[PDB]
């Protein structure tokens, strides 16, 4: 039913829309939907929306570039060697989509959580941050998360102002007489640990001195960057 009425509708999509969709459907980090020549993905973890309009050429793509979608707008075209940003929209050869959507996924980083009351129960609310600026920076340097660097969360200690990696935070707060488990909310700064530079950068590409981190984080960084 919602199988044939599914196979029939799908089969009637334009070849182009099918081709583009076939580039993205394996990226299960996103929930996908198709409507006409528009492919919409919803990042499963963060709920970030990605709208992909399929166009026949650059003129069309450029015309669609001007579009608010309350999320990431991408215009996919069959033209090769095309990759630029116009009016905030990505305009790219559809063969760059898979790599682009994956880079986008790598840039939607968990930054904290908050526990909220809800219908008599406590519910955890996660905070995600789409690092678009860093995304563009990494694409230009052909930098790949997990390969040339990784994003990692550090907590800004309300006691010494030093940055401590999330894992050593428990022990760190303990030494201050503060119990981590009694906290019902926390926010972290997301830093980049660059394997190439053997240095730490903020989410904007700016380098961060090592003295900004607690003695614990310091060695952790040293450990990771090796
Ligand atoms: Zn501290």
Domain locations in the chain?
A: 1-106, 107-226
Eight-class DSSP state of 141 = T
- Topology, domain 107-226: Nucleoside Triphosphate Pyrophosphohydrolase (3.90.79)
- Reference 225, options 206, 210, 214, 203; nearest CA is 210
CATH number of the 1-106 domain: 3.40.1350.70
Please tell me the experimental approach by which this structure was elucidated.
X-ray
Ligand 1 centre and the CA of 176: distance in Å? Answer: 7
Distance between CA atoms of 87 and 179, rounded to whole angstroms?
A: 47
Query: Residue 70 corresponds to which tokens in the numbers above?
Result: 């309350």
Eight-class DSSP state of 2 = T
Residues facing residue 152 across a β-bridge: 191
Ligand 1 centre and the CA of 197: distance in Å? Answer: 27
Ligand 1 centre and the CA of 2: distance in Å? Answer: 57
Distance between CA atoms of 185 and 190, rounded to whole angstroms?
A: 16
Radius of gyration of the chain measured on its C-alpha atoms: 21
Q: What are the residues whose beta carbons fall under 8 Å from the beta carbon of 86, sequence distance 6 or more? A: 62, 65
Ligand 1 centre and the CA of 199: distance in Å? Answer: 22
Q: How far apart are the first and last CA of the chain?
A: 55
- Reference 42, options 18, 24, 67; nearest CA is 24
Contact indicator for 95, 78 with CB cutoff of 8 Å: no
Neighbour count for residue 225 (Cβ, 10 Å): 15
Query: Residue 215 corresponds to which tokens in the numbers above?
Result: 């003695």
Ligand 1 centre and the CA of 186: distance in Å? Answer: 14
Ligand 1 centre and the CA of 215: distance in Å? Answer: 10
Q: At residue 220, what are phi and psi to the nearest 5 degrees?
A: -60, -45
Structure's resolution in angstroms = 2.3
Query: Residue 168 corresponds to which tokens in the numbers above?
Result: 């050593």
- Reference 165, options 223, 100, 93, 204; nearest CA is 223
Ligand 1 centre and the CA of 162: distance in Å? Answer: 6
- Reference 41, options 87, 1, 98, 79; nearest CA is 98
- Reference 212, options 166, 142, 165; nearest CA is 165
Cα angle 139-21-66, degrees, rounded to a multiple of 5: 60
């Amino acid at each position: 039913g919602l199988v044939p009425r599914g196979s029939h509708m799908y089969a009637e999509l334009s070849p182009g829309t099918k081709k583009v969709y076939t580039q993205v459907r394996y990226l299960d980090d996103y929930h996908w939907e198709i409507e006409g020549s528009t492919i919409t993905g919803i990042h499963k973890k963060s709920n970030v929306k990605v709208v992909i309009d399929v166009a026949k050429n650059r003129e069309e793509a450029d015309s669609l570039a001007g579009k608010d979608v309350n999320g990431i707008h991408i215009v996919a075209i069959p033209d090769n060697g095309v990759f630029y940003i116009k009016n905030g929209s990505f305009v790219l050869t559809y063969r760059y989509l898979k790599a682009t959507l994956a880079d986008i996924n790598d840039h939607i980083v968990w930054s904290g959580f908050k526990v909220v009351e809800d219908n008599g129960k406590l519910v955890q609310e996660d905070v995600y941050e789409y690092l678009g600026a860093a995304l563009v920076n990494h694409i230009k340097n052909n930098a790949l998360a997990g390969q040339d660097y990784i994003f990692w969360q550090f907590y800004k200690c309300e006691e010494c102002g030093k940055y401590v990696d999330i894992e050593n935070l428990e022990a760190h707060l303990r030494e201050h007489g503060i119990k981590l488990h009694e906290k019902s909310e926390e926010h972290y700064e997301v830093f980049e640990l660059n394997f190439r530079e053997g240095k730490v950068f903020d989410k904007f590409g700016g380098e961060v001195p090592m003295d900004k981190f607690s003695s614990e984080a310091r060695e952790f960084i040293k450990e990771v960057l090796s």
